[PDB]
Amino acid sequence: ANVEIYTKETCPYCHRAKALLSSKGVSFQELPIDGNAAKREEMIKRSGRTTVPQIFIDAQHIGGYDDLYALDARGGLDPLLK
């Protein structure tokens, strides 16, 4: 599954999403913005937001933890990730 999450040093909702994904025990990628700028610009073209957490599930930009956790709440996260 193609899963990516942009993050930073101080992002409580990043920790929220990652804690759920580690409870599910899925395989995902993390993308730090900590000192970054060129891949933060990448996140402009990708997300159209430039804020975090911003999860992408099978390259599909979901949005943040609440958006992701809703995708889990509908049982729709699992058939993409697992």
Short mmCIF file of C-alpha atoms in Angstrom, two decimals, residues 3-45:
data_model
loop_
_atom_site.label_atom_id
_atom_site.label_comp_id
_atom_site.label_asym_id
_atom_site.label_seq_id
_atom_site.Cartn_x
_atom_site.Cartn_y
_atom_site.Cartn_z
CA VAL A 3 0.94 5.39 2.35
CA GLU A 4 2.66 8.61 3.32
CA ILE A 5 2.30 11.04 6.22
CA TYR A 6 3.98 14.45 6.42
CA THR A 7 4.97 15.38 10.04
CA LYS A 8 6.96 17.80 12.35
CA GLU A 9 8.64 17.92 15.84
CA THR A 10 5.44 19.24 17.44
CA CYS A 11 2.35 17.81 15.75
CA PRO A 12 -0.08 16.18 18.25
CA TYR A 13 -2.38 15.05 15.41
CA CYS A 14 0.65 13.48 13.61
CA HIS A 15 1.24 11.46 16.77
CA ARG A 16 -2.55 10.69 16.85
CA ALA A 17 -2.56 9.26 13.30
CA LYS A 18 0.75 7.37 13.70
CA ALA A 19 -0.42 5.89 17.03
CA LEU A 20 -3.55 4.54 15.27
CA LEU A 21 -1.49 3.17 12.36
CA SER A 22 0.93 1.45 14.79
CA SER A 23 -2.10 0.05 16.70
CA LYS A 24 -3.24 -1.39 13.34
CA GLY A 25 0.47 -2.30 12.80
CA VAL A 26 0.40 -1.21 9.16
CA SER A 27 3.38 -0.34 6.97
CA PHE A 28 3.54 3.45 6.21
CA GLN A 29 6.08 6.18 5.24
CA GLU A 30 6.74 9.33 7.29
CA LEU A 31 7.99 12.63 5.77
CA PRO A 32 9.54 15.16 8.18
CA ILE A 33 9.18 18.92 7.60
CA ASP A 34 11.77 19.50 10.37
CA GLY A 35 14.32 21.82 8.69
CA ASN A 36 12.76 20.99 5.26
CA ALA A 37 11.56 23.46 2.57
CA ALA A 38 12.00 21.76 -0.86
CA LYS A 39 9.74 18.81 0.10
CA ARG A 40 7.48 21.28 1.94
CA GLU A 41 7.07 22.87 -1.53
CA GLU A 42 6.41 19.30 -2.79
CA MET A 43 3.58 19.18 -0.20
CA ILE A 44 2.06 22.33 -1.78
CA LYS A 45 1.71 20.56 -5.15
#
